[PDB]
Amino acid sequence: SQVRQNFHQDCEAGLNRTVNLKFHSSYVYLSMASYFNRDDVALSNFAKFFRERSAAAKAHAEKLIEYQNQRGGRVFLQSVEKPERDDWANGLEALQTALKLQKSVNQALLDLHAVAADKSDPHMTDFLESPYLSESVETIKKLGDHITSLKKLWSSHPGMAEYLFNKHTLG
Amino acid sequence: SQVRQNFHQDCEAGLNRTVNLKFHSSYVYLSMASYFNRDDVALSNFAKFFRERSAAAKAHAEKLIEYQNQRGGRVFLQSVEKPERDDWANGLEALQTALKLQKSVNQALLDLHAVAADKSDPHMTDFLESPYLSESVETIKKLGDHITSLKKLWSSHPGMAEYLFNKHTLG
Amino acid sequence: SQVRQNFHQDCEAGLNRTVNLKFHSSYVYLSMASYFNRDDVALSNFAKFFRERSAAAKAHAEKLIEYQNQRGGRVFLQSVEKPERDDWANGLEALQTALKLQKSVNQALLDLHAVAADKSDPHMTDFLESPYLSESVETIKKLGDHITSLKKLWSSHPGMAEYLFNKHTLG
Amino acid sequence: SQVRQNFHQDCEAGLNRTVNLKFHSSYVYLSMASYFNRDDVALSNFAKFFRERSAAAKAHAEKLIEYQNQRGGRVFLQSVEKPERDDWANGLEALQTALKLQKSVNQALLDLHAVAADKSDPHMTDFLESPYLSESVETIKKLGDHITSLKKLWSSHPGMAEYLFNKHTLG
């Protein structure tokens, strides 16, 4: 590629693994969003919250593909694995799963950053820092906060907990 | 000082002790505000409430320094002692601590007022009355009211209590 | 903390030392601001300049506390030491002291950055770079410029120097 | 007087002495204002500054007369003594004279306040505190500041001092 410069094979490869990871998390969140819109769950604001999480992950995957092109790397798309579950049990459990999800995605980004730094690619590290890494910690803190608030209410009445939270926090 | 007139040493000294007191209470409130923003506490409106309490105390300290200058007294700043605790347990406890804090600060202001009156300084007593003393009783009554409302809810479920109050009263 | 990830003890500790440092510099500047408002100094724009320096340092300390929370670290506040002097002699001397102050604070930030880099924390280094490090060099250059301009005038008449500068540069 | 209530003879008498005092200070300031408009002095902003000082004193005298009526006391006007000088030498000297003037007027008000307090008249003390006493200290501090700034410049060149100050401070 007449455009490629100071762009290592490992950073190119790591970039492709990371877009698939982003697509998978988006799919996981779409699943949760759909689950909360079931007539037997009916927590519209929980569903709305995960639709946003999904859209954001989808957008990140798309920007990574664009970055691959901008640097002269070549895009290779892999199949997107289905979410691990079809039923998400409840609001607290869905929320807890997402925290783990966000942390493993955050770990992958840190790893990609490390390769970029190790290969001396200041353009990629700068690119990965904002808004990717910053987005991760903000979301993780937000999710962490939500889990704490829901746990408090849960101790009293889980049924009333989800309803109150769905309305006053996610609404 | 070519400006000094009818300004006693004790009122000058008492003024400096009181600014340090104001700075300390501001620091105490900053501590509480930070505590409520912890991912394991997550009571954003409680944090917001104490940020206001802090800013107000900081502002009072600053106006007292200005008053010292306006009268021809000389400002002497002392170190600001750290808050007594790093952990504030919970919403009710933080609220109760603040009531005591506000009352001891209110007592100090009454004492400063008494010295000013005793030294026959109508400018300082007038200055201390509004908005300092008036600010104190308004805040004390507000804090007293909040403690009552939180105690009611607390009897049922503390977890749900903090969440409801954080939303409907402090929000 | 369910939120903590890739956040080292040293970066957490260094963050707490740095907020205390920021609080102390803010206190130093408040002192200078008050000094210039004395009826026997009367350099209102010098006072105004240091009130800004103070407010900015206070704001930085507050953002660092927020960063500590966002990463899952725990805030520990220490006492804030009083400024080294109560009298700042004159405009040039106050200005020179501030340059040293800003440089030692800038050095501390570079040191904190080095620990973050050494521990491989791209989120913290990115956070420290803008706007902290950038704020430091801009302020240092501004202070350096002011000292040069005041020195020129000083050689002729210090009395007239402070008055002219207070009006045409700081005004 | 069908209106008089809790109004002592001494407070009534002290009120009349104080209006004459206010009228005299107004006259003194009119004199200074006129002096600075002389073709051989020509410091228009100094003149403008003293016209304001004059108008303010005149206004205070008028409000005191109104207060006398509102309480059911009876107004007795005395002759207004001419200012002590016709020539005010220069800007610094005029400024210094005014500081003394303002302090002796401030002392008289404190004395009147003391009689009111001693006679247990909360309406008069409240009336004397704002805006009379507060006006006094604000003006005294302002005058004190101006004298300091002018002294600095004076040390270098008095001629240039008055000109610069007339333009940059009083303008």
XYZ file of C-alpha atoms in Angstrom:
684
model
C 0.000 0.000 0.000
C 1.435 3.330 -1.140
C -0.016 4.804 2.050
C 1.338 2.412 4.672
C 3.991 3.801 6.973
C 5.260 2.730 10.394
C 2.330 0.314 10.632
C 3.210 -3.120 12.016
C 1.556 -6.469 11.104
C 0.689 -7.104 14.764
C -1.111 -3.795 15.124
C -2.968 -4.515 11.900
C -3.874 -8.002 13.161
C -4.774 -6.807 16.636
C -7.023 -4.188 15.108
C -9.023 -6.858 13.238
C -9.413 -9.042 16.357
C -10.642 -5.998 18.272
C -13.363 -5.083 15.741
C -14.763 -8.606 15.965
C -14.718 -8.238 19.765
C -16.610 -4.950 19.494
C -19.182 -6.536 17.141
C -19.671 -9.389 19.584
C -20.277 -7.114 22.581
C -22.759 -5.104 20.483
C -24.606 -8.396 19.732
C -24.585 -9.336 23.410
C -26.186 -5.966 24.307
C -28.780 -6.275 21.521
C -29.720 -9.595 23.112
C -30.139 -8.015 26.564
C -32.145 -5.118 25.079
C -34.517 -7.548 23.411
C -34.854 -9.578 26.605
C -36.037 -6.596 28.601
C -38.729 -5.824 26.029
C -40.368 -9.207 26.568
C -43.913 -8.917 27.845
C -42.875 -11.044 30.827
C -39.956 -8.775 31.774
C -41.165 -5.369 30.648
C -38.352 -3.052 31.804
C -38.346 -0.615 28.914
C -35.643 1.675 30.302
C -33.275 -1.267 30.905
C -33.842 -2.245 27.261
C -33.232 1.353 26.173
C -29.997 1.453 28.215
C -28.618 -1.656 26.502
C -29.660 -0.425 23.051
C -27.325 2.496 23.672
C -24.507 0.238 24.898
C -24.984 -1.797 21.689
C -25.040 1.154 19.296
C -21.874 2.521 20.910
C -19.960 -0.759 20.529
C -21.139 -1.016 16.915
C -19.841 2.520 16.294
C -16.452 1.703 17.818
C -16.118 -1.348 15.589
C -16.861 0.836 12.568
C -14.266 3.480 13.520
C -11.633 0.763 13.955
C -12.352 -0.495 10.426
C -11.913 3.072 9.175
C -8.645 3.379 11.074
C -7.406 0.179 9.434
C -8.062 1.765 6.026
C -6.560 5.135 6.919
C -3.245 3.471 7.866
C -3.123 1.243 4.783
C -3.898 -1.987 6.577
C -6.382 -4.491 5.202
C -9.711 -5.393 6.770
C -10.559 -9.029 7.457
C -13.940 -9.713 9.009
C -14.646 -12.880 11.010
C -17.984 -14.396 11.991
C -19.715 -12.826 14.983
C -20.391 -15.342 17.687
C -23.880 -15.395 19.217
C -24.269 -14.168 22.810
C -23.626 -16.745 25.510
C -27.228 -16.612 26.765
C -30.712 -15.991 25.444
C -32.206 -15.321 28.886
C -30.546 -12.727 31.145
C -32.383 -13.633 34.358
C -32.938 -10.130 35.693
C -31.800 -6.512 35.831
C -29.005 -6.974 38.353
C -27.590 -10.013 36.556
C -27.685 -8.294 33.152
C -25.931 -5.291 34.676
C -23.231 -7.482 36.286
C -22.589 -9.352 33.059
C -22.085 -6.059 31.240
C -19.487 -4.939 33.799
C -17.443 -8.069 33.099
C -17.965 -7.611 29.385
C -16.756 -4.013 29.503
C -13.713 -4.983 31.532
C -12.598 -7.734 29.166
C -13.040 -5.376 26.218
C -11.093 -2.750 28.146
C -8.344 -5.310 28.773
C -8.139 -6.124 25.057
C -7.765 -2.417 24.217
C -4.971 -2.052 26.792
C -3.257 -5.031 25.165
C -3.623 -3.515 21.706
C -2.239 -0.276 23.108
C 0.763 -2.135 24.506
C 1.586 -3.639 21.114
C 1.298 -0.212 19.473
C 3.603 1.316 22.100
C 6.032 -1.597 21.796
C 6.147 -1.142 18.015
C 6.610 2.619 18.483
C 3.401 3.759 16.806
C 2.429 7.097 18.412
C -0.438 7.585 15.972
C -2.191 4.361 17.045
C -1.613 4.846 20.778
C -2.966 8.382 20.547
C -5.929 7.009 18.562
C -6.581 4.245 21.121
C -6.409 6.619 24.106
C -9.249 8.923 23.045
C -11.975 8.138 22.849
C -11.578 4.358 23.246
C -9.790 3.904 26.567
C -11.520 6.943 28.040
C -14.898 5.594 26.914
C -14.123 2.312 28.672
C -13.404 3.704 32.130
C -16.371 6.078 32.012
C -18.711 3.203 31.144
C -17.169 0.867 33.720
C -17.626 3.506 36.463
C -21.203 4.143 35.325
C -21.977 0.414 35.351
C -20.267 0.043 38.732
C -22.420 2.835 40.145
C -25.629 1.300 38.753
C -24.830 -2.099 40.252
C -24.323 -0.499 43.673
C -27.628 1.369 43.556
C -29.523 -1.713 42.401
C -27.961 -3.924 45.109
C -29.200 -1.571 47.831
C -32.797 -1.745 46.569
C -32.492 -5.471 45.875
C -31.949 -6.270 49.549
C -35.439 -4.970 50.308
C -37.568 -6.161 47.372
C -36.142 -7.271 44.004
C -39.510 -6.834 42.265
C -39.905 -3.257 43.465
C -36.161 -2.717 42.978
C -36.179 -3.225 39.219
C -39.324 -1.148 38.814
C -37.986 1.819 40.851
C -34.550 1.728 39.215
C -36.012 1.338 35.714
C -37.986 4.525 36.351
C -35.717 6.747 38.471
C -32.266 5.848 37.287
C -32.559 4.463 33.765
C -35.456 6.785 32.998
C -2.863 51.254 59.195
C -4.118 54.660 58.067
C -7.513 53.015 57.595
C -7.996 51.303 60.951
C -10.652 52.773 63.197
C -12.595 51.380 66.154
C -11.233 47.928 65.315
C -10.098 45.891 68.323
C -7.254 43.306 68.420
C -9.660 40.621 69.666
C -12.055 41.140 66.783
C -9.118 41.023 64.391
C -7.855 37.823 66.045
C -11.290 36.251 66.248
C -11.794 36.974 62.578
C -8.649 35.002 61.659
C -9.648 32.006 63.823
C -13.067 32.015 62.165
C -11.709 31.927 58.589
C -9.627 28.870 59.450
C -12.782 27.300 60.920
C -14.679 28.047 57.709
C -11.857 26.542 55.602
C -11.908 23.420 57.747
C -15.668 22.889 57.410
C -15.342 23.381 53.635
C -12.659 20.622 53.628
C -14.883 18.347 55.699
C -17.730 18.778 53.162
C -15.393 18.195 50.198
C -14.490 14.911 51.883
C -18.154 13.891 52.236
C -18.868 14.915 48.622
C -16.032 12.736 47.389
C -17.187 9.829 49.546
C -20.630 9.794 47.990
C -19.148 9.662 44.490
C -17.398 6.375 45.236
C -18.566 3.566 42.995
C -19.496 1.622 46.134
C -21.674 4.419 47.547
C -22.989 6.096 44.418
C -25.360 8.749 45.818
C -24.699 11.524 43.337
C -27.230 13.978 44.767
C -25.809 13.589 48.297
C -22.383 14.386 46.818
C -23.851 17.370 44.961
C -25.482 18.615 48.190
C -22.176 18.573 50.079
C -20.312 20.225 47.196
C -22.658 23.160 47.701
C -22.155 23.167 51.482
C -18.386 23.212 50.798
C -18.437 26.002 48.218
C -20.550 28.130 50.564
C -18.158 27.714 53.509
C -15.217 28.500 51.217
C -17.002 31.686 50.104
C -17.650 32.756 53.697
C -13.984 32.295 54.557
C -13.061 34.487 51.592
C -15.484 37.279 52.574
C -14.078 37.276 56.114
C -10.562 37.757 54.715
C -11.884 40.686 52.677
C -13.538 42.140 55.764
C -10.229 41.919 57.626
C -8.626 44.009 54.867
C -11.468 46.515 54.637
C -11.130 47.326 58.363
C -7.335 47.602 58.278
C -6.646 44.382 60.126
C -3.989 41.946 58.974
C -4.616 38.460 57.629
C -2.818 35.486 59.158
C -3.573 32.098 57.655
C -3.085 28.863 59.611
C -2.869 25.298 58.324
C -6.173 23.616 57.510
C -6.641 20.438 59.453
C -7.784 17.349 57.538
C -11.330 16.080 58.156
C -11.754 13.750 61.111
C -12.805 10.821 58.899
C -12.189 9.479 55.422
C -15.263 7.226 55.439
C -18.659 8.742 56.310
C -20.547 5.467 56.781
C -23.816 6.465 55.142
C -26.237 9.228 54.192
C -27.878 9.631 57.588
C -24.552 9.693 59.431
C -23.037 12.234 57.023
C -26.129 14.397 57.440
C -25.963 14.181 61.262
C -22.287 15.077 61.319
C -22.996 18.162 59.226
C -25.679 19.320 61.680
C -23.137 19.228 64.508
C -20.577 20.909 62.296
C -22.969 23.719 61.401
C -23.906 24.230 65.030
C -20.327 24.528 66.260
C -19.572 26.986 63.460
C -22.733 28.870 64.386
C -21.575 28.943 68.014
C -18.199 30.384 66.995
C -19.926 33.154 65.012
C -22.137 34.003 68.006
C -18.979 34.218 70.114
C -17.293 36.488 67.585
C -20.442 38.597 67.553
C -20.326 38.874 71.338
C -16.757 40.178 71.272
C -17.690 42.728 68.598
C -20.685 43.890 70.653
C -18.586 43.991 73.824
C -15.972 46.128 72.061
C -18.739 48.366 70.676
C -18.181 47.673 66.985
C -21.552 48.168 65.237
C -19.990 47.694 61.808
C -18.751 44.169 62.617
C -21.930 43.056 64.394
C -24.017 44.284 61.474
C -21.614 42.465 59.125
C -21.811 39.230 61.152
C -25.624 39.282 61.339
C -26.284 39.208 57.589
C -25.632 37.031 55.879
C -23.517 34.945 58.283
C -25.778 34.298 61.268
C -28.856 34.180 59.050
C -27.128 31.689 56.747
C -26.378 29.491 59.760
C -29.925 29.121 61.059
C -31.355 28.554 57.583
C -28.850 25.760 56.945
C -29.333 24.227 60.393
C -33.130 24.124 59.872
C -32.664 22.642 56.396
C -30.298 19.979 57.744
C -32.658 19.300 60.653
C -35.530 18.786 58.223
C -33.480 16.427 56.027
C -32.456 14.303 59.006
C -36.108 13.927 60.026
C -37.215 12.845 56.558
C -34.356 10.366 56.235
C -35.021 8.855 59.689
C -38.619 8.078 58.723
C -37.539 6.177 55.597
C -34.621 4.579 57.439
C -36.932 2.736 59.823
C -38.348 0.787 56.884
C -35.332 0.082 54.655
C -32.032 2.003 54.845
C -30.977 0.831 51.371
C -34.189 2.042 49.755
C -34.159 5.083 52.056
C -30.946 6.571 50.695
C -31.965 5.851 47.117
C -35.429 7.472 47.461
C -34.112 10.494 49.366
C -31.172 10.961 46.980
C -33.703 11.162 44.149
C -36.753 12.939 45.604
C -35.267 15.294 48.127
C -31.674 15.983 47.113
C -32.572 15.742 43.438
C -13.443 -2.121 43.991
C -15.479 -3.769 41.238
C -14.381 -0.897 39.001
C -10.618 -0.937 39.513
C -8.554 -2.091 36.568
C -4.902 -1.611 35.628
C -4.607 0.957 38.421
C -1.429 0.690 40.498
C -1.030 1.543 44.226
C 1.748 4.029 43.418
C -0.396 5.935 40.949
C -3.199 5.980 43.499
C -0.782 7.215 46.183
C 0.892 9.728 43.904
C -2.505 11.087 42.975
C -3.321 11.816 46.639
C 0.034 13.553 47.254
C -0.567 15.691 44.171
C -4.027 16.902 45.269
C -2.574 18.071 48.578
C 0.145 19.873 46.593
C -2.504 21.555 44.443
C -4.473 22.604 47.556
C -1.323 24.071 49.065
C -0.459 26.148 45.988
C -4.064 27.409 45.895
C -3.647 28.511 49.558
C -0.352 30.214 48.751
C -2.041 32.206 45.938
C -5.010 33.126 48.157
C -2.442 34.557 50.564
C -0.798 36.656 47.829
C -4.212 37.837 46.576
C -5.145 38.999 50.053
C -1.792 40.732 50.488
C -2.280 42.867 47.409
C -5.686 44.027 48.639
C -4.159 45.563 51.758
C -4.718 49.295 51.963
C -0.940 49.717 52.182
C -0.261 47.721 49.001
C -3.356 48.399 46.929
C -2.583 46.599 43.646
C -6.044 45.321 42.825
C -5.124 43.727 39.496
C -2.217 41.804 41.069
C -4.704 40.505 43.655
C -7.161 39.618 40.884
C -4.400 37.769 38.987
C -3.553 35.593 41.995
C -7.224 34.906 42.747
C -7.358 33.297 39.317
C -4.156 31.310 39.907
C -5.729 30.092 43.180
C -9.103 29.131 41.721
C -7.351 27.197 38.949
C -5.194 25.183 41.369
C -8.270 24.469 43.501
C -10.073 23.199 40.384
C -7.170 20.924 39.450
C -7.153 19.419 42.932
C -10.875 18.722 42.598
C -10.512 17.030 39.186
C -7.746 14.804 40.565
C -10.059 13.681 43.383
C -12.691 12.863 40.759
C -10.133 10.927 38.738
C -9.239 8.903 41.832
C -12.910 7.917 42.152
C -13.395 7.189 38.458
C -10.520 4.661 38.521
C -11.663 2.969 41.733
C -8.923 4.358 43.928
C -9.637 5.756 47.372
C -9.272 9.383 48.407
C -7.192 10.284 51.452
C -6.973 13.959 52.322
C -4.081 15.389 54.353
C -3.847 18.713 56.170
C -3.058 21.739 54.019
C 0.041 23.511 55.179
C -0.125 27.300 55.550
C 1.822 29.423 53.047
C 5.464 30.034 53.885
C 4.949 33.799 54.250
C 2.264 36.246 55.289
C 3.955 39.238 53.640
C 4.975 38.990 49.968
C 7.175 42.099 49.864
C 6.157 43.391 46.449
C 4.828 42.631 42.976
C 8.075 41.371 41.474
C 8.835 39.126 44.449
C 5.316 37.656 44.494
C 5.600 36.992 40.766
C 9.013 35.297 41.165
C 7.777 33.097 43.986
C 4.880 31.938 41.826
C 7.259 30.943 39.013
C 9.145 28.669 41.408
C 5.878 27.366 42.786
C 4.572 26.531 39.319
C 7.803 24.795 38.395
C 7.864 22.553 41.458
C 4.224 21.635 40.856
C 5.087 20.979 37.219
C 7.963 18.751 38.349
C 5.637 16.750 40.606
C 3.220 16.193 37.702
C 6.077 14.999 35.471
C 7.052 12.576 38.236
C 3.491 11.308 38.554
C 3.416 10.921 34.784
C 6.612 8.875 34.905
C 5.133 6.455 37.434
C 1.993 6.080 35.307
C 4.097 5.394 32.201
C 6.322 2.984 34.128
C 3.254 1.089 35.356
C 1.839 1.085 31.810
C -1.279 3.144 32.483
C -2.166 4.924 29.210
C -5.393 6.287 30.674
C -3.586 8.186 33.457
C -0.772 9.494 31.250
C -3.309 10.735 28.718
C -5.260 12.313 31.599
C -2.132 13.983 33.028
C -1.026 15.376 29.651
C -4.134 17.463 28.956
C -4.937 19.720 30.488
C -2.519 19.385 33.429
C 0.941 19.392 31.858
C -0.189 21.758 29.114
C -1.661 24.112 31.718
C 1.682 24.124 33.532
C 3.871 25.219 30.631
C 1.394 27.872 29.502
C 1.315 29.371 33.000
C 5.088 29.147 33.431
C 5.629 30.989 30.113
C 3.039 33.605 31.084
C 4.693 34.121 34.476
C 8.124 34.228 32.830
C 6.912 36.923 30.445
C 5.401 38.994 33.276
C 8.616 38.854 35.296
C 10.587 40.128 32.294
C 8.242 43.054 31.691
C 8.225 44.015 35.365
C 12.040 43.843 35.627
C 12.408 46.346 32.784
C 10.139 48.882 34.507
C 11.663 48.107 37.904
C 15.084 49.357 36.828
C 13.630 52.840 36.381
C 11.184 53.240 39.285
C 9.752 50.321 41.296
C 6.890 52.457 42.641
C 5.794 53.547 39.177
C 6.600 50.060 37.862
C 3.996 48.247 39.940
C 1.387 50.905 39.240
C 1.918 50.850 35.438
C 2.058 47.051 35.251
C -0.974 46.632 37.527
C -2.911 48.817 35.091
C -1.567 47.952 31.623
C -0.659 44.319 31.924
C -2.735 42.819 34.727
C -5.651 45.097 33.904
C -45.878 64.928 68.315
C -48.574 62.272 67.967
C -45.985 60.190 66.120
C -43.061 60.297 68.542
C -42.257 57.062 70.318
C -39.136 55.787 72.075
C -37.221 58.745 70.639
C -34.852 60.445 73.085
C -33.902 64.169 73.168
C -30.203 63.292 72.847
C -30.752 61.238 69.717
C -32.838 64.063 68.292
C -30.105 66.575 69.185
C -27.293 64.358 67.966
C -29.116 63.914 64.691
C -29.194 67.693 64.111
C -25.474 68.100 64.918
C -24.692 65.294 62.477
C -26.601 66.852 59.549
C -24.643 70.077 59.982
C -21.452 67.981 59.998
C -22.525 66.277 56.772
C -23.317 69.659 55.159
C -19.900 70.949 56.168
C -18.014 67.990 54.680
C -20.039 68.387 51.464
C -18.921 72.068 51.356
C -15.309 71.068 51.962
C -15.459 68.633 48.999
C -17.136 71.223 46.749
C -14.171 73.462 47.546
C -11.653 70.761 46.569
C -13.612 69.981 43.378
C -13.514 73.626 42.366
C -9.803 73.854 43.150
C -8.935 71.040 40.782
C -10.830 72.718 37.945
C -8.591 75.780 38.114
C -6.686 76.366 34.903
C -3.470 76.221 36.936
C -4.279 72.825 38.478
C -6.326 71.158 35.765
C -6.942 67.668 37.199
C -10.464 67.109 35.944
C -10.838 63.575 37.303
C -9.729 64.660 40.799
C -12.408 67.372 40.616
C -14.957 64.809 39.417
C -14.014 62.478 42.301
C -14.631 65.179 44.913
C -17.901 66.252 43.280
C -19.109 62.729 43.987
C -17.839 62.803 47.582
C -19.735 66.106 47.993
C -23.008 64.932 46.460
C -22.930 61.834 48.671
C -22.440 63.829 51.887
C -25.225 66.204 50.827
C -27.512 63.196 50.282
C -26.699 61.768 53.714
C -27.529 65.084 55.356
C -30.876 65.085 53.554
C -31.748 61.521 54.634
C -30.945 62.402 58.251
C -33.371 65.340 58.071
C -36.009 62.947 56.730
C -35.283 60.507 59.541
C -35.765 63.302 62.074
C -39.235 63.921 60.616
C -40.173 60.249 60.388
C -39.511 59.790 64.130
C -41.370 62.945 65.165
C -38.303 64.951 66.074
C -37.888 68.560 65.009
C -35.305 69.861 62.561
C -33.034 72.736 63.552
C -30.540 73.894 60.955
C -27.333 75.725 61.902
C -25.020 77.789 59.712
C -22.573 75.837 57.566
C -19.015 76.813 58.260
C -16.764 77.527 55.270
C -13.989 75.026 54.491
C -10.742 75.526 56.378
C -8.779 76.268 53.189
C -9.312 77.792 49.774
C -6.168 76.241 48.278
C -5.632 72.474 48.608
C -1.975 72.408 47.542
C -2.056 69.245 45.456
C -3.666 65.879 44.761
C -1.965 63.939 47.542
C -2.693 66.611 50.148
C -6.355 66.899 49.122
C -6.654 63.119 49.314
C -5.042 63.007 52.789
C -7.302 65.741 54.108
C -10.347 63.806 52.930
C -9.194 60.682 54.794
C -9.079 62.658 58.041
C -12.403 64.255 57.219
C -14.040 60.886 56.596
C -12.634 59.480 59.814
C -13.902 62.312 61.999
C -17.331 62.021 60.384
C -17.172 58.270 60.939
C -16.291 58.892 64.592
C -19.293 61.200 65.010
C -21.607 58.530 63.561
C -20.190 55.915 65.953
C -20.867 58.341 68.802
C -24.428 58.921 67.630
C -24.835 55.161 67.380
C -23.620 54.767 70.956
C -26.216 57.218 72.256
C -28.958 55.409 70.325
C -27.835 52.051 71.741
C -27.553 53.516 75.240
C -31.096 54.892 74.979
C -32.302 51.527 73.635
C -33.425 52.702 70.204
C -33.096 49.707 67.839
C -34.717 51.616 64.986
C -32.042 54.348 65.001
C -29.092 51.978 65.429
C -30.365 49.844 62.562
C -30.818 53.042 60.519
C -27.295 54.272 61.347
C -25.655 50.930 60.498
C -26.793 50.751 56.869
C -25.964 52.549 54.828
C -24.205 55.178 56.973
C -21.548 53.258 58.893
C -21.026 50.864 55.995
C -20.627 53.804 53.609
C -17.963 55.249 55.906
C -15.653 52.240 56.020
C -15.955 51.612 52.284
C -14.981 55.216 51.540
C -12.168 55.226 54.100
C -10.688 52.041 52.563
C -11.042 53.504 49.065
C -9.335 56.734 50.140
C -6.639 54.751 51.955
C -5.965 52.750 48.798
C -5.768 55.893 46.638
C -3.292 57.543 49.001
C -1.043 54.472 48.829
C -1.058 54.376 45.033
C -0.366 58.101 44.768
C 2.508 57.943 47.291
C 4.281 55.304 45.198
C 4.146 57.471 42.061
C 4.946 60.608 44.057
C 8.365 59.290 45.056
C 9.397 59.303 41.398
C 7.823 62.472 39.966
C 4.937 64.362 41.614
C 4.080 66.182 38.371
C 3.810 62.960 36.386
C 2.219 61.270 39.412
C -0.887 63.446 39.487
C -1.278 63.258 35.722
C -1.005 59.430 35.585
C -3.279 58.901 38.592
C -5.840 61.440 37.349
C -6.051 59.420 34.134
C -5.643 55.768 35.171
C -7.199 55.655 38.589
C -9.677 58.520 38.845
C -10.549 58.211 35.168
